Amino acid sequence: IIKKELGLEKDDKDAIEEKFRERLKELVVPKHVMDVVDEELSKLGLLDNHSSEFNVTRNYLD
Amino acid sequence: GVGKTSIARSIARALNREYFRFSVGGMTDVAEIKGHRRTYVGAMPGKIIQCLKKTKTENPLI
Numbered sequence A: 001i002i003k004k005e006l007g008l009e010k011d012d013k014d015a016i017e018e019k020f021r022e023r024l025k026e027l028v029v030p031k032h033v034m035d036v037v038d039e040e041l042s043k044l045g046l047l048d049n050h051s052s053e054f055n056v057t058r059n060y061l062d
Numbered sequence B: 001g002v003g004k005t006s007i008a009r010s011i012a013r014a015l016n017r018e019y020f021r022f023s024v025g026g027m028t029d030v031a032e033i034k035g036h037r038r039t040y041v042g043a044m045p046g047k048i049i050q051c052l053k054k055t056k057t058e059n060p061l062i
């Protein structure tokens, strides 16, 4: 419970999401690919982490 | 670009029923209409449910 108060930090992991966002942050990214990446990340979140489609989406995003 | 969407909007306006459009172009996963079994985390209902929710009626123009 002490952790729940602060230990969890109530912060979503989003390791792949945050990593890719920081990776593309420095780059001068076009808006079309920006929205495409946003949609791909939304789909990745919508899917599970133990399915082939998840790995395919991660590979395409990489 | 012929106005078919505009035609449907005008028909909804004339008929006194709410309007809604759905995109089924190249779609493959029926989930977007069937949602998901709602026991997996993050499951969302199909677009028809959202259409009913926003339209606030059971007799809109789909």
Ligand SMILES: Nc1ncnc2c1ncn2[C@@H]1O[C@H](COP(=O)(O)OP(=O)(O)O)[C@@H](O)[C@H]1O
Pocket: B001, B002, B003, B004, B005, B006, B007
């Ligand atoms: N007969 C018409 N009279 C006036 N406007 C029209 C007519 N046909 C099309 N439009 C215009 O087309 C637009 C919508 O086109 P849209 O429904 O997107 O075409 P499509 O159905 O081919 O995608 C509207 O803004 C409307 O002004």
